[PDB]
Design a protein around this nucleic acid. Structure first.
Ligand SMILES: [K+]
Ligand SMILES: [K+]
Ligand SMILES: [K+]
Ligand SMILES: [K+]
Ligand SMILES: [K+]
Ligand SMILES: [K+]
Ligand SMILES: [K+]
Ligand SMILES: [K+]
Ligand SMILES: [K+]
Ligand SMILES: [K+]
Ligand SMILES: [K+]
Ligand SMILES: [K+]
Ligand SMILES: [K+]
Ligand SMILES: [K+]
Ligand SMILES: [Mg+2]
Ligand SMILES: [Mg+2]
Length: 1323
DNA sequence: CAATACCGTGTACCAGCTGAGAGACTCT
DNA sequence: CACGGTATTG
């Protein structure tokens, strides 16, 4: 009675099967609980659990942060009102009340219905004088008269509620008054250097050309046009691009060897400009200085479109400009339409359903939708030239609250705010005392490194307080410890040392950590010369010498440098051979050289006394990102260096963390030697033990202290903390649960083996392509504009990624010829089963790669390596892709053997984690030598094994027929894996978790590893094999080709498979989010307790968490007589907590009385019901049902559908043609299933007519569409499908009355344990 | 209760920690 | 996207 378990782990399924030593699936009687006739049932021990995908926490996180945003914005308004409270009471005692109740209707209003002034005359007068809030903003900024306190509040509140972004550091002081003079000064500074070839700025309207509502690039072309004998890629062209906020590269301008890309907005611009000036000289400094100057004057030309010399509120003035032009253009457009085409006027100005001005202002039409609607109308009319000009600049009839206002920095709003405060503090003293308070309310932002301002009731918070008092925008620095919080922000997330768990790992760029990495690589290098008999380790003295002379003088150390600069220069070796490193050393002393460039003091860095200091500095540069805190923490070392060095140190920041702690690296000492790990790396006699040898050596103390430092998660917690998609972690947890239930099913006997197999955006594509094209300087999107959806075509995506060129040949590709080109695998897919862009390429003909058995040929490499490097720099291909392309100049036979091995050997980390979990759960006992006793072998397989087995022995799978293929996959996994390790017991080292003992031959072996199943094999030449296959040594039978294939065939043909759909309470959003207009419908849900939706509108479409069976009574008629009822009441997500708090009260409040409490059945989604003739239904909600049966199509028809549909060989085609009649029979099957179970008369008859319509079609296509027909019978929700060209729309089960009298089936996870409840016996 | 058709919150920026893949060193 | 909510037509 021994058995094995097969598992197929996916993101929506866990297939499971139990097999004996004869590869048979057992069957058992299982008890059946409940109140029905049936006391037990026969079950095959095979099946599959289905479940809805697990979801990421991301959407939840976005919702949470937006909630915190709304809370804090409301609090901003509340702070402001609190400052205004006393004096507004003197001016208008119900102003803020009218504001808070502005949403209410006039019935529900407690005050007068005009919010600002409280009477109609003054309200109309206000709106006449101030059509938009920006009119009032500009008036309050510019005017000197005392103003109404309510208008002052409204202006400041508008600025504080919509305050703009915080993406620009420092203060901004708009001034565009002398852009022309700054541009002329730039031209003068340039012409100073180049007296031989100056630029004549006379007549160049830089103010207009550069501030035009055009792209930065567009304006570059125009301006260069104004400068004769000057070209856009010359030096002045690049300086103009610089002033415009572009990223020009001055490499060609100065004949540099390295790139000199420069961007003014980048926070690294100062050091980059110093880099460049070190290359070219400080005589050019002024040049870039001048650039900066001009750049400060035109920085915001796009949002500030008004002369800043007339008003101190140029943003509101630009909004007023939008408004005035909207008015003028609307007047003109109305007149033009009235004149030239009156019949359209209504449509344009009255029909909200159309995308006219009506839909633009009152309907749901957007500015883009509106422009698209009205542009043909404009082009048809005459007199619309300037209107079309504004239309094609996205600047016609603009609103003032638009999508593009995200550009506006908070400094602009703050400027207008401070201006209003300065104006009106002359008249209201409280505005003078609270000016900085209001400014702070606008400017204050919770720092990212502080997080929620919690008090011990937030699982997301880490902030610590200096004092226990309420935090406000004004006492934040005093109440909150910014430093401790910034530290905890990073430290709550960083690893501890796996060897010393109570120690934090070092920063990745710590000097100590890089010394460690270097010496660790160095201590395993070996060398020989002529006179040497055998390879020798480097001594301690030799390694110190190499670090000093090579690693501390070059950022990277190449093997050639090691050979010449050391062995020749120091040891006088004319020739030497090196091992332990190839080409160059992986490790390096990057931080050493950075700090050298900064402090310019080699002796300081090399002095060991300073070790700690440097560590701390790097820690501070890694831990903190706020330059002020960096300064605060580094101040204690400001005495050791001068001002300029501290200035450079601040701008020097690092990210990233290592794997080891300082205590492990250079702290713990071996008791006898008294040496740290780094000491042994520096010098260890002639043993040269490295880190792994050092921590595992029993003749040293290190291993003991590691064990002393070592130190209880649950299964759920352990699985949650794995790295992987939540969708697959769900499947992993369900897998472990399934294995537990199966073990219990076998009387708590553990299996011999467990075989596990695990199965294997348009905006990102658009972003990649935009970035690559703008990095390329290409106009390919100008000439061939593309939308993100279109990029889902593989060949077009590859076209855009390749700059429209063949990759194996330096020739342009043609878009319209994409169908004629080839997509080739760089490494051939017979070796590396990689089908991603990283291994694929668009070429005219794949023949041009060279030979199809290897990497693209050397000739192609020689041709194209420069273009490939250009694509790599633009990040249009990856380094992996470039390396695979260029490998011919560097596939050995070892590579191909390894590629096959990896085709068959699972090495994914996540599958290894599933294997670890199962292996640790099964094998818990240790033997007399304290070794683990591996009772259960956990085998892991890739899908190709069972896939090839299916395709070889005609056990074909068609996913669309039903869900059985998951269970069948589990069974085949078990069979193949157990047979495999039975045949070749050595292969355990590769397939069993935890098992380990450490080219043409291994290639042959691993390619033909599965031949032992076959009777005859064609390698190549024909090989014949015996009928009974046995173990090499034991002689145990492993495969009988005369019986075991029949066994697999009978198992795959079993009609009773335990497909279980995991019942799940629904969670998440309460309902659809659309805030719908008011309506008469009880289906409307109030958005606030007192906002009756009949007056105010609200949400509809709530999601049901789970339904509830109620047996009770309802009042009927005017008399209110009671009437016994049994019905399904869906409990929505919003009602759930209330219903669970006290269910009888909830139900009585719903209109049910005398509810039978013990007969209340909670029915989660997908709950299973059986009716008549075995027809099964699943709960989709309280009012809808899903198909609940599986169509067990006979195996012969499955294989027919596979081969006939081309899902080659002559025997297969003759079988397809000989068994053509099968088509009819298949339909018959479907029909007889539907009439019994699906119950969709109209859809079924439409399908039958469609099949009888296309009988004369090729058998291949009729099969390809019979595949689509199974959507009619598929388990789950009804869905639309298409037969050839006809469309069958889903038939929905829109009533749940029938299941109230049917049989409810409570299933365990495997579905073996059932509890059946006859619901007709209730009521 | 049909059959049927419609509908469904979206975008943008900034600061991090983590593992994993891939294909080559060194090792337990 | 998909599939459950809703209103409409009957
Ligand atoms: K019973
Ligand atoms: K966010
Ligand atoms: K009223
Ligand atoms: K020119
Ligand atoms: K609109
Ligand atoms: K015309
Ligand atoms: K609006
Ligand atoms: K290397
Ligand atoms: K940092
Ligand atoms: K292994
Ligand atoms: K729950
Ligand atoms: K959930
Ligand atoms: K969900
Ligand atoms: K269940
Ligand atoms: Mg709220
Ligand atoms: Mg709004």
């Amino acid at each position: 009675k021994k058995y094995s378990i097969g598992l197929a782990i996916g993101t929506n399924s866990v297939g499971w099967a139990v097999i004996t030593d004869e590869y048979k699936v057992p069957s058992k009687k299982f008890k059946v609980l409940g109140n029905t006739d049936r006391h037990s049932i026969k079950k095959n021990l095979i099946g599959a659990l289905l479940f809805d995908s697990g979801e990421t926490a991301e959407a939840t996180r976005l919702k949470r942060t937006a909630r915190r945003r709304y809370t804090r914005r409301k609090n901003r308004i509340c702070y402001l009102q609190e400052i205004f409270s006393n004096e507004m009471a003197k001016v208008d005692d119900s102003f803020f009340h009218r504001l808070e109740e502005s949403f209410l209707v006039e019935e529900d209003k407690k005050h007068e219905r005009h919010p600002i002034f409280g009477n109609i005359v003054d309200e109309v007068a206000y709106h006449e004088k101030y059509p938009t809030i920006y009119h009032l903003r500009k008036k309050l900024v510019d005017s000197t008269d005392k103003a109404d306190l309510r208008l002052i509040y409204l202006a400041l509140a508008h600025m504080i509620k919509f305050r703009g972004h915080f993406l620009i550091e420092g203060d901004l002081n708009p001034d565009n008054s002398d852009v022309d003079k700054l541009f002329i000064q730039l031209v003068q500074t340039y012409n100073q250097l180049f007296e031989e070839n100056p630029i004549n700025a006379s007549g160049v309207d830089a103010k207009a050309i550069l501030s035009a509502r055009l792209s930065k690039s567009r304006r570059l072309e125009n301006l260069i046009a104004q400068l004769p004998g000057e070209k856009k890629n010359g030096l002045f062209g690049n300086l103009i691009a610089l002033s415009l906020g572009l990223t020009p590269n001055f490499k060609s301008n100065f004949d540099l060897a390295e790139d000199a890309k420069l961007q003014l907005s980048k926070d690294t611009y100062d050091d980059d400009l110093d880099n460049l000036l070190a290359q070219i000289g400080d005589q050019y400094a002024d040049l870039f200085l001048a650039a900066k100057n001009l750049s400060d004057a035109i920085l915001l030309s796009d949002i500030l479109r008004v002369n800043t010399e007339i008003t101190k509120a140029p943003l509101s003035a630009s909004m007023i400009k939008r408004y005035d032009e909207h008015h003028q253009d609307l007047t003109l457009l109305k007149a033009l339409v009235r004149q030239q085409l009156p019949e359209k006027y209504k449509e344009i100005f009255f029909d909200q359903s159309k995308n006219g001005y009506a839909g633009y202002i009152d309907g749901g039409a957007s500015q883009e939708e509106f422009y698209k609607f009205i542009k043909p109308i404009l082009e048809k009319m005459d007199g619309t030239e300037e209107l079309l000009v504004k239309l094609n600049r996205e600047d016609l009839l603009r609103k003032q609250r638009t999508f593009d206002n995200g550009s506006i920095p908070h400094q602009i709003h703050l400027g207008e705010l401070h201006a209003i405060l300065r104006r009106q503090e002359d008249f209201y003293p409280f505005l003078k005392d609270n000016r900085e308070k209001i400014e702070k309310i606008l400017t204050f932002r919770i720092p990212y490194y502080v997080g929620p301002l919690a008090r011990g009731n937030s699982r997301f918070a880490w902030m610590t307080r200096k004092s226990e008092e309420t935090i406000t925008p004004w006492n934040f620095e005093e109440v909150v410890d910014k430093g401790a919080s910034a530290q905890s922000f990073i430290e709550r997330m960083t690893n501890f040392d796996k060897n010393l768990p109570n120690e934090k790992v070092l920063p990745k760029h710590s000097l100590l950590y890089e010394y460690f990495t270097v010496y660790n690589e160095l201590t395993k290098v070996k060398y020989v010369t002529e006179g040497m008999r055998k390879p020798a380790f480097l001594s301690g003295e030799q390694k110190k010498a190499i670090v000093d002379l090579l690693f501390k003088t070059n950022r990277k150390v190449t093997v050639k440098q090691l050979k010449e600069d050391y062995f020749k220069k120091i040891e006088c070796f004319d020739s030497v051979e090196i091992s332990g490193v190839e080409d160059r050393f992986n490790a390096s002393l990057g931080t050493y050289h950075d700090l050298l460039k900064i402090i310019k003091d080699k002796d300081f860095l090399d002095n060991e006394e300073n070790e700690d200091i440097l560590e701390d500095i790097v820690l501070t540069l890694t831990l903190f990102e706020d330059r002020e805190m960096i300064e605060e923490r580094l101040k204690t070392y400001a005495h050791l260096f001068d001002d300029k060095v501290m200035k450079q140190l601040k701008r020097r920041r690092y990210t990233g963390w290592g794997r080891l702690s300082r205590k492990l690296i250079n702290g713990i000492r071996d008791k006898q030697s008294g040496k740290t790990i780094l000491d042994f790396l520096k010098s260890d006699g002639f043993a040269n033990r490295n880190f792994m040898q050092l921590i595992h050596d029993d003749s040293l103390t290190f291993k003991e202290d590691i064990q002393k430092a070592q130190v209880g998660d649950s299964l759920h917690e352990h699985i949650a903390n794995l790295a992987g998609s939540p969708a697959i972690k769900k499947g992993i947890l369900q897998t472990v649960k399934v294995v537990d239930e199966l073990v219990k099913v076998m009387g708590r006997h553990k299996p011999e083996n467990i075989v596990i197999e695990m199965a294997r955006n348009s905006r990102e594509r658009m972003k990649r392509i935009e970035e690559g094209i703008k990095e390329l300087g290409s106009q390919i999107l100008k000439e061939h504009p593309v939308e993100n959806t279109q990029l889902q075509n593989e060949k077009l995506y590859l076209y855009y990624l390749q700059n429209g060129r063949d990759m194996y040949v330096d020739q342009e590709l043609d878009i319209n010829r994409l169908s004629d080109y080839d997509v080739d695998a760089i490494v051939p897919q017979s070796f590396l089963k990689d089908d991603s862009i990283d291994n694929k390429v668009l070429t005219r003909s794949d023949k041009n790669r060279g030979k199809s058995d290897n990497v693209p040929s050397e000739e192609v490499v020689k041709k194209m390596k420069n273009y490939w490097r250009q694509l790599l720099n633009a990040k249009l291909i990856t380094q992996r892709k470039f390396d695979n392309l260029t490998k011919a100049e560097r596939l050995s036979e070892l590579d191909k053997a390894g590629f096959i091995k990896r085709q068959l050997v699972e090495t994914r980390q996540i599958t290894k984690h599933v294997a670890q979990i199962l292996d640790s759960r099964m094998n818990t006992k240790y033997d007399e030598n304290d070794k683990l006793i591996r009772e259960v072998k956990v085998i892991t397989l890739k899908s190709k094994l069972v896939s090839d087995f299916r395709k070889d022995f005609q056990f074909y799978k068609v996913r669309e027929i039903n869900n059985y293929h998951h269970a069948h996959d589990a069974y085949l996994n078990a069979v193949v894996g157990t047979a495999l390790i039975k045949k070749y017991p050595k292969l355990e080292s590769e397939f069993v978790y935890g098992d380990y003992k450490v080219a043409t031959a291994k290639y042959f072996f691993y390619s033909n590893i599965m031949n032992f199943f076959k009777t005859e094999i064609t390698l190549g030449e024909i090989r014949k094999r015996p009928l009974i296959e046995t173990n090499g040594e034991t002689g145990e039978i492993v495969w009988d080709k005369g019986r075991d294939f029949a066994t697999v065939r009978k198992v795959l043909s079993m009609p009773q498979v335990n497909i279980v759909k995991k019942t799940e309470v629904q969670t998440g959003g309460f309902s659809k989010e659309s805030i719908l207009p008011k309506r008469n419908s009880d289906k409307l849900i109030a958005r606030k307790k007192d906002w009756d939706p009949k007056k105010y509108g609200g949400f509809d479409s709530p999601t049901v968490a789970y339904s509830v069976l109620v047996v009770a009574k309802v009042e009927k008629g005017k008399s209110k007589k009671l009437k016994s009822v049994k019905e399904l009441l869906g409990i929505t997500i919003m009602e759930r907590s209330s219903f669970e708090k006290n269910p009888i009260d909830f139900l009585e409040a719903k209109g049910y009385k005398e509810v039978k409490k013990d007969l209340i059945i909670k029915l989660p989604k997908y709950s299973l019901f059986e009716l008549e003739n075995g027809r099964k239904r699943m709960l989709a909600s309280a009012g809808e049902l899903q198909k609940g049966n599986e169509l067990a199509l006979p195996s012969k028809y499955v294989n027919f559908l596979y081969l006939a549909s081309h899902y080659d060989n002559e025997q297969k085609q003759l079988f397809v043609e000989q068994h053509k009649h099968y088509l009819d029979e298949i339909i018959e099957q479907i029909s007889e299933f539907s009439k019994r179970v699906i119950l969709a008369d109209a859809n079924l008859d439409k399908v039958l007519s469609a099949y009888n319509k296309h009988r004369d079609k090729p058998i291949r296509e009729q099969a390809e569409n019979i595949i689509h027909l199974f959507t009619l019978t598929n388990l789950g929700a009804p869905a639309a499908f298409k037969y050839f060209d006809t469309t069958i729309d889903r038939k929905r089960y829109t009533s749940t009355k029938e299941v109230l009298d049917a049989t409810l089936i409570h299933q365990s996870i495997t579905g073996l344990y059932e509890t059946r409840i006859d619901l007709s016996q209730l009521g």
